[PDB]
Amino acid sequence: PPPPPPPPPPPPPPP
Amino acid sequence: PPPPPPPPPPPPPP
Amino acid sequence: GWNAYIDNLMADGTCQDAAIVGYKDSPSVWAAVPGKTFVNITPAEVGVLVGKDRSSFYVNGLTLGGQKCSVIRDSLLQDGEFSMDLRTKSTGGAPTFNVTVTKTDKTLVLLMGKEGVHGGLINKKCYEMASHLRRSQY
Amino acid sequence: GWNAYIDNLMADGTCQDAAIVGYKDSPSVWAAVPGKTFVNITPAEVGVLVGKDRSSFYVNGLTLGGQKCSVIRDSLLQDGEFSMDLRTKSTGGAPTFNVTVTKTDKTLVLLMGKEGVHGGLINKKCYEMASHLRRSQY
Numbered sequence: 455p456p457p458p459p460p461p462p463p464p465p466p467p468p469p
Numbered sequence: 470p471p472p473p474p475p476p477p478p479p480p481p482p483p
Numbered sequence: 484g485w486n487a488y489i490d491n492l493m494a495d496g497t498c499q500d501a502a503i504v505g506y507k508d509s510p511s512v513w514a515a516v517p518g519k520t521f522v523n524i525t526p527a528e529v530g531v532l533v534g535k536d537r538s539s540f541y542v543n544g545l546t547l548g549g550q551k552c553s554v555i556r557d558s559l560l561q562d563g564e565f566s567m568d569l570r571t572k573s574t575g576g577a578p579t580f581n582v583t584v585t586k587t588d589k590t591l592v593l594l595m596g597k598e599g600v601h602g603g604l605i606n607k608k609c610y611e612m613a614s615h616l617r618r619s620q621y
Numbered sequence: 622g623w624n625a626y627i628d629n630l631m632a633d634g635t636c637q638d639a640a641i642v643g644y645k646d647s648p649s650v651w652a653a654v655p656g657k658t659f660v661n662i663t664p665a666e667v668g669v670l671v672g673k674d675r676s677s678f679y680v681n682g683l684t685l686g687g688q689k690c691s692v693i694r695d696s697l698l699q700d701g702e703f704s705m706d707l708r709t710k711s712t713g714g715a716p717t718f719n720v721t722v723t724k725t726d727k728t729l730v731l732l733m734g735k736e737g738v739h740g741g742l743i744n745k746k747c748y749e750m751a752s753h754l755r756r757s758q759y
């Protein structure tokens with residue numbers, strides 16, 4: 455069973 | 470006197 | 484949310500599935516398009532993608548979310564590229580799609596194009612996301 | 622922070638100056654290339670760039686960091702365009718440089734080309750950055 459994922463960095467802007 | 474600039478968004482690909 | 488990343492990859496309408504999978508320690512799909520195939524990726528599938536044996540899938544094929552694929556180009560482990568291209572296996576006459584898996588420090592970016600979408604297009608989209616992740620040390 | 626945007630705009634070597642300027646409420650240079658012209662932009666100059674009067678700078682021109690310029694095309698406030706093209710005022714027979722300033726919701730992006738670089742090249746460079754910002758609600 456996996457641990458919760460790390461906090462993601464800001465994603466790129468939308469198209 | 471201006472306030473400090475807000476944090477910027479992620480820049481575009483180098 | 485890691486999900487905000489899936490919206491990004493699905494925004495222009497060229498792809499039908501996308502996924503961000505963590506492959507270290509205890510593999511897991513961090514984010515995916517609900518109800519599709521990538522969501523169903525198992526640690527076993529992540530195992531062969533990053534496995535050290537990069538020749539056995541060229542003979543028996545590959546599987547993602549239980550969907551049979553054929554490897555066409557493997558540079559997943561090669562620096563500067565970290566990308567692997569694939570094609571789904573026509574479900575009896577059915578149409579096949581192009582898939583591209585890119586690998587970063589801690590994740591696997593997967594993307595599946597819609598019917599007839601240039602695989603090189605799918606590749607670039609994928610490749611640019613991984614680069615964005617690598618720039619933030621992910 | 623914002624200084625990283627200057628690095629992006631200066632990366633290819635075609636431009637010699639660049640600046641990100643915040644023009645609402647209390648005008649300020651958020652980031653600029655050190656020791657150049659734009660780094661010395663004043664709130665008064667930002668006032669003219671985005672002021673209501675869009676005809677007076679055509680007769681006497683304007684300055685940027687104290688550098689006199691002539692306005693060529695002005696679509697700064699025009700929706701869909703948000704760009705203004707200029708050219709430095711030749712100090713006698715001295716070389717002139719093409720400048721383009723684009724406007725986002727919170728910033729002004731300025732770009733000055735090196736001698737002889739096409740003004741339309743400098744314009745696209747600038748316009749693409751403003752677009753990145755805009756799409757990031759900035």
Ligand SMILES: *C(O)Cc1c(C)c2ccc(O)cc2oc1=O
Nearest residue numbers: 455456457508509510526527530
């Ligand atoms: C919970 O996710 C336990 C688990 C682990 C750690 C695992 C590691 C590596 C491979 O290849 C498969 C795994 O399946 C698991 O259920």
Ligand SMILES: *C(O)Cc1c(C)c2ccc(O)cc2oc1=O
Nearest residue numbers: 470471472646647648664665668
């Ligand atoms: C500090 O920056 C004070 C200041 C303000 C608020 C200002 C607003 C608008 C214009 O056109 C000029 C300004 O100069 C200032 O010094």
